Design a protein around this ligand. Structure first.
Ligand SMILES: [Co+2]
Ligand SMILES: [Co+2]
Ligand SMILES: [Co+2]
Lengths: 210, 210, 210
């Protein structure tokens, strides 16, 4: 028979999750019916979650998405275990953003473009563009950054205001420290602000169809 | 309660889209129930759209998919804004194919393999294979081309009859002009014709299950 | 009207598939409602299939997933044609694992991480981690291997106990023979066993929600 389900659901009971949690989603955010949002997740105001995105906070938790951010088609957010079966927090898998602990922290005015992925432990600072098919894992991406399409940040801290060229896989802190800077003449210098404006308007337009 | 929705839908009203449009889909095309097709989209005859694909024509529009083409699992089609909020067409984000304007143009007998992405402005010429996990953005891919798995074309024109080796990210016109040619002994020389034959038969078989 | 469908379905009748087959899924496996599983597929015990995964055995068949393996969000399994329209088996597109023929063979205790893809003909040996956004096509990956995020294996045999560095695309047997070995001090040496433990527990937790 037809597959009947809820796409916004609590996470399952496991040895590291005694008490199930359901997503906390601002009334102004739009969650596409063909997106999936599971578990201990906070979604801020004016956020657009597109078809085929999967936000799954059932292993490492919590997963936060700030105000006016977007999670585009096929994007995945997931995280390594943050608390072991013996009730001990796995500090290496927990990110600290302003005195609060997260598995994945997506800041405000952040664009996660189509088919990208941010896997915890990870943090992405405000007004950053994570390009199409890009990857972030075990990293902290600063504010006002640009990850071009197919770039990746693994095990590093990307300083504020830097970009990663298309296709480059950054795996060492020495490499991350030498990334190029966003300047006004850089091709993606204005991309994130335009994308956030478009996506905040799409969230409202789609909300008016539900 | 269960998530109830239509997977083939009109696009939302926004400042660049006063009048919503619904997809125009040929009766011989097959759209999987777990694919999403939104907005100002034209889908040609005998096209197969597989599970988890997302064709979203709500920002840049229109998005065209020609006859006997295929949009495989997890493929995304989306596009940059083609008309600003002041009603002016953004010509840099509009592609011209035979005297008609598109955000994304996918030609006839084109295969978009699993997890690939074509982001407008972009055009993909007839009888071209866009490989698994490949990426096309701000580019024109000619006819009878092959993008091997994990290749990418960004900001360039790929001449007719050329291929991009697996994993290569092409970002300059000088690089695109020097791509290798498809010859009969090239490993993917016959791939697209076989894939189109298989996919046209799958579209019909799946249509017979609906 | 709302899109009503079954996400676990038989494959379509085609010239290479006279008699449709439906998936054989162990009662202990968990198939997310937003995953798709089509055709001649065998899923073993304690397997977790996550949101937006697509397992499609309608071209090359069969597709096997062994016990205690996981198919994470947005993963695709598909395969090249294994039998032509003249009823002849295409031996180059068929993989042999223990005296049985498969289009795609995923062994036991194998992790297919988010957005990865394994395209037949292909085999992945037991206790192997296929990282985030990785790709396997026309290859045999041995047991106890690690494909780091964004790595790829195309047209090769990856010897048992080896790893592929993040972002590396391996397309020649000479390259595959020289891959580095997994040792206890290697960063991903314990990853797969932890991931399988977590995923077997998630499968059970999610089963308790259905
Ligand atoms: Co994960
Ligand atoms: Co887009
Ligand atoms: Co395929």
């Amino acid at each position: 028979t037809v597959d009947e389900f809820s796409n916004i659901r609590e996470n399952p009971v496991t040895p590291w999750n005694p008490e199930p949690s359901a997503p906390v989603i601002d009334p102004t955010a739009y969650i596409d019916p063909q997106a999936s949002v599971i578990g201990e997740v906070t979604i801020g105001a004016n956020v657009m979650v597109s078809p085929m995105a999967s936000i799954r906070s059932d292993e490492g938790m919590p997963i936060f998405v700030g105000d006016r951010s977007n999670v585009q088609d096929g994007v995945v957010l997931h995280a390594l275990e943050t608390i072991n079966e013996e009730g001990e927090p796995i500090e290496d898998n927990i990110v600290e953003v302003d005195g609060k602990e997260y598995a994945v922290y997506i800041g405000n005015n952040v664009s996660l473009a189509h088919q990208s992925q941010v896997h915890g432990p990870a943090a992405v600072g405000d007004d950053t563009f994570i390009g199409m098919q890009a990857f972030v894992f075990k990293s902290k991406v600063g504010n006002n950054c640009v990850l071009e399409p197919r770039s990746a940040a693994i095990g590093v801290t990307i300083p504020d205001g830097r970009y990663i060229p298309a296709g480059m896989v950054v795996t060492s802190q020495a490499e991350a420290d030498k990334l190029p800077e966003v300047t006004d003449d850089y091709a993606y210098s204005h991309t994130n602000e335009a994308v956030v404006y478009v996506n905040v308007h799409l969230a409202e337009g789609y909300k008016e169809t539900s």
